[PDB]
Curated annotation (Swiss-Prot), chain A:
NCBIfam families hit by this protein: moaA
Cofactor comment text: Binds 2 [4Fe-4S] clusters. Binds 1 [4Fe-4S] cluster coordinated with 3 cysteines and an exchangeable S-adenosyl-L-methionine and 1 [4Fe-4S] cluster coordinated with 3 cysteines and the GTP-derived substrate.
Species, as recorded: Staphylococcus aureus (strain N315)
Binding site for GTP: R14, R68, T99, K160, R263, A264, R265
Name the UniProt record assigns to this protein: GTP 3',8-cyclase
């Protein structure tokens, strides 16, 4: 069994499938930076679906059970159903999820379902249509994505919703969004906003922690804690007492979780990373694969990359924050 | 003035173990089968002296230690413990000195300790029913005796908190009676998840009651709200009674391990340094180091080196092995 320097196994391959996106969310792909001038990866500089499938097969043999399709906005990747069909035929792979702004769900949703997609995570940072647009800078209304969510649900997809909260910006959406998704029996998850400051610890200025979110929510809702489904479950779940619909809170910053992190990551340009943060360019899997290698030489290269992994960025910021309290 | 270890963690707390002796034989700590008649405890001269401890505490205060916890063993068994408290009370930079005790000897020594500057104690008490408690301590001590010690300690002006380790099948039926009793005494109680490493070798949950489960038990008898953390990376998760307002704590030693904020150095009763509560091998011989003849600077430089190479994270390792054993 394959474990890194901190004793963590490989479970979870995050597959980035494009660098492109149809939103320009102020904190992720700001319009300044990613303007009209931006040149994105060309077609041939992305991994093919066949190379993706090959990589996934090899990872399955090392322990990976789950694959999360991301980008970018994944639905801009043109024949995404084809990847999903190939991923769904890999034996050790048990779950495939997709993480999306949901805009293209009415165009590509049925195709993806028919290829074997069953679960999606839709990010939506407000339910107000105005405030959603000022976040996304592409004149989309939240109402539009709500309708996409309803379509996805109608064709049999399981939908969960991810909201990153910022304390001058998203503060006040917490209660309306719980009410709306409570009614629709859809699991929503509030996520603490991550931002490292000058002192190299966490910056709590635009943060609303799990514990303050929870003070807000109890004032408006009657609620019970749900016991962790399995050990090391990341999200802290709660249940509305009247109808048992669940929501979750993700303690990105106030309670870092690197010790249970089993996530390996392939960028859209085809480079291996052991963590969502990372200064240097990672191993060039794309280059390696295109210069003829056996499956066995691929497996051993991924094994060696994992066994050398000691990433724990969020825990490091956590420790530095303790140090800065002085 | 601020020293960090290999995982970015500053030194902040010093646990000083002052004896290996104890007046109990708690089944999960000093079982009588191991610590019975033929056990040999440390000779007196192999303990650190109080001067050695004060000198060690001083140099650690220069490296950023702010809190000292006195423990053991049962620290009240150490003769003239009040002389140690008095020397530690004279050290610049130390803001808090705490004692953790089973409490049995608090009537005997409490006033002396108070006089010497002690103001805070943490009393370990795993049950409030007498028959049960006797079955745990294995020395025929009644919980009622410990309760009277607690009430004397508060009366002389010590601040008392209570710690309770819960093992499923043994004392988990005690969570409610103890919450009720100390709620009415305005004393903060804390429940701690039992740590036990299984064969395999992540955590053994076989009795383990988790913080989550403890809370499901608790919210039925009492109406409760969270208390937000007083500071960032506070280990205990606090709650308060809506009545009233008395706080209690729950400690997720096993279900939510917290090595990332761990700022604890430890000296054993035989005077060896440990960077963690769990250790399989002997630590650096601080005791022989200082008895070999060293300067305060040489001492400080060694403590700084011991901390800079520290990478312990036992509970997180166990947590990772647990995730890894799920396959
Ligand atoms: C990069 S998008 C990729 C998939 C798709 N475009 C989407 O947004 O659903 C994935 C997530 O990163 C999150 N994100 C970016 N920066 C973040 C930050 N500083 N703190 C918390 N989440 C962040 C966004 O909320 C988003 O849900
Ligand atoms: C070594 S005693 C020293 C102080 C004093 N003799 C007392 O018992 O309070 C310190 C603590 O270690 C704790 N402890 C020992 N083994 C434990 C375990 N497996 N899980 C949780 N706590 C444990 C005991 O409950 C006790 O409170
Ligand atoms: S939609 Fe997703 S990838 Fe695009 S700018 Fe927003 S968070 Fe970023
Ligand atoms: S910051 Fe920690 S939990 Fe997040 S991807 Fe990196 S190692 Fe994993
Ligand atoms: S009283 Fe404290 S040191 Fe003594 S056996 Fe019990 S837990 Fe251990
Ligand atoms: S197990 Fe972790 S939290 Fe506990 S003393 Fe060791 S390093 Fe610190």
């Amino acid at each position: 069994q394959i474990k890194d320097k901190l004793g963590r196994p490989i479970r979870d391959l995050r597959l980035s499938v494009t660098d492109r996106c149809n939103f320009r969310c102020d904190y992720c792909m700001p319009k300044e930076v990613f303007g009209d001038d931006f040149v994105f990866l060309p077609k041939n500089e992305l991994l093919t679906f066949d190379e993706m499938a090959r990589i996934a097969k090899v990872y399955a043999e090392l322990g990976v059970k789950k694959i999360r399709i991301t980008g970018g906005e994944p639905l801009m990747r043109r024949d995404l159903d084809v990847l999903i069909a190939k991923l769904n035929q890999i034996d050790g792979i048990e779950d495939i999820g997709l993480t999306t702004n949901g805009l293209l769900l009415k165009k590509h949703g049925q195709k993806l379902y028919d290829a074997g997609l069953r679960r999606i995570n839709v990010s939506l940072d407000a339910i107000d249509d105005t405030l959603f647009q000022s976040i996304n800078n592409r004149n989309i209304k939240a109402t539009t994505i709500l309708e996409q969510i309803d379509y996805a649900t109608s064709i049999g997809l399981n939908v969960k919703v991810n909201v990153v909260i910022q304390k001058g910006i998203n503060d006040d959406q917490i209660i309306p969004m719980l009410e709306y998704f409570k009614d629709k029996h859809i699991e929503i998850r509030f996520i603490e906003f991550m931002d490292v400051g000058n002192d190299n610890g966490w910056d709590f200025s635009k943060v609303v922690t799990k514990d303050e979110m929870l003070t807000m929510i109890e004032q408006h809702f009657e609620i019970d804690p749900v016991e962790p489904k399995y050990f090391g479950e990341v999200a802290k779940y709660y249940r509305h007492k009247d109808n048992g619909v669940q929501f979750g809170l993700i303690t990105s910053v106030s309670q870092s979780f690197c010790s249970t992190c089993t996530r390996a990551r392939l960028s859209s340009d085809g480079k291996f990373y052991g963590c969502l943060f990372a200064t240097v360019d990672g191993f060039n899997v794309k280059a390696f694969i295109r210069s003829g290698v056996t499956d066995e030489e691929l497996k051993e290269q991924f094994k060696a990359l994992w066994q050398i992994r000691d990433d724990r960025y969020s825990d490091e910021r956590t420790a530095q924050t303790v140090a800065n309290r002085q």
